[PDB]
Design a protein around this ligand. Structure first.
Ligand SMILES: [Zn+2]
Ligand SMILES: [Zn+2]
Lengths: 70, 206
């Protein structure tokens, strides 16, 4: 009975579970560029949203430094 | 592919999603034919060089997902709130210290990301909390000192992210958010909370 964090519908297919949330397989995607992701892709957690590696590299240095020290 | 070709392909194959992330775009009006794509439901313009969004955004009337993450946007048009179908709006990592008149008029908005801007409680439009369809509101990395009690009107909120603001207190009305599952409040200046919020972990205050 998991509801997709993105489309807000009951997930009919397989459930992608990550970051204490659930997504449809075809909804799970980078929160900052919307590129489709799977749990086999490299991504980071940012306020409990997935951010792909390529996007995270573009974050401001001051923020990356704070998130690392944390 | 060129931006010209991406617009042409979208129109010809009636593709609802347009991906123009990281394409060096400095002005949406200079993306040839972009605003003629009335059918599209997703437009991704993350990681570009935008400083403004033109009123023509209203012409993309079927947008459900609109992503401006990591641009340099300083101002939005009032037309941004005309998007009747818009469910996801990412304005993270821009230069916003203001939102336009009537921003709260978006009737379907479910996820609003305003992370990493220059916003405070004074930046919110008078009708901001008419956005009662919101499920997730991201305000982290901003300059809020107070959060208005009107936050309690967002009764469908599941996620409220307030990390790394300047909050000195939290409104009791957060306790009214029966669906709330995530509350990010690390990095603020919180000391003691209203009893209605109960025992929230106040670890990691600055
Ligand atoms: Zn879904
Ligand atoms: Zn990404």
């Amino acid at each position: 009975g998991d509801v997709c964090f993105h489309c807000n519908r009951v997930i009919e297919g397989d459930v992608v579970s990550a970051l204490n949330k659930a997504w449809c397989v075809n909804c799970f995607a980078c929160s900052t560029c919307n590129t489709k992701l799977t749990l086999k892709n490299k991504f980071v957690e940012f306020d409990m949203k997935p951010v792909c590696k390529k996007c995270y590299e573009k974050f401001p240095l001051e923020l990356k430094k704070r998130l690392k020290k944390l | 592919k060129s931006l010209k070709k991406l617009v042409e392909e979208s129109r010809e194959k009636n593709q609802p999603e347009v991906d123009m992330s990281d394409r060096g775009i400095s002005n949406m009006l200079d993306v040839n034919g972009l605003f003629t794509l009335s059918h599209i439901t997703q437009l991704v313009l993350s990681h570009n060089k935008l400083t403004m969004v033109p009123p023509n955004i209203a012409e993309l009337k079927n947008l459900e997902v609109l992503n401006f993450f990591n641009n340099q946007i300083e101002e939005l048009p009032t037309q941004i709130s005309s998007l009747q179908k818009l469910k996801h709006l990412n304005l993270g990592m821009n230069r916003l210290n203001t939102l336009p008149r009537g921003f709260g008029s978006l009737p379907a908005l479910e996820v609003l990301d305003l992370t990493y801007n220059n916003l405070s409680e004074n930046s919110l439009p008078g009708n901001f909390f008419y956005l009662t369809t919101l499920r997730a509101l991201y305000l982290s990395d901003n300059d809020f000192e107070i959060l208005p009690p009107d936050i309690g009107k967002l009764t469908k909120l599941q996620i409220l992210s307030l990390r790394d603001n300047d909050l000195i207190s939290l409104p009791k009305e957060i306790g009214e958010l029966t669906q709330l599952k995530e509350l990010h409040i690390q990095g603020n200046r919180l000391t003691v909370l209203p009893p209605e919020l109960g025992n929230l972990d106040l670890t990691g205050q600055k």
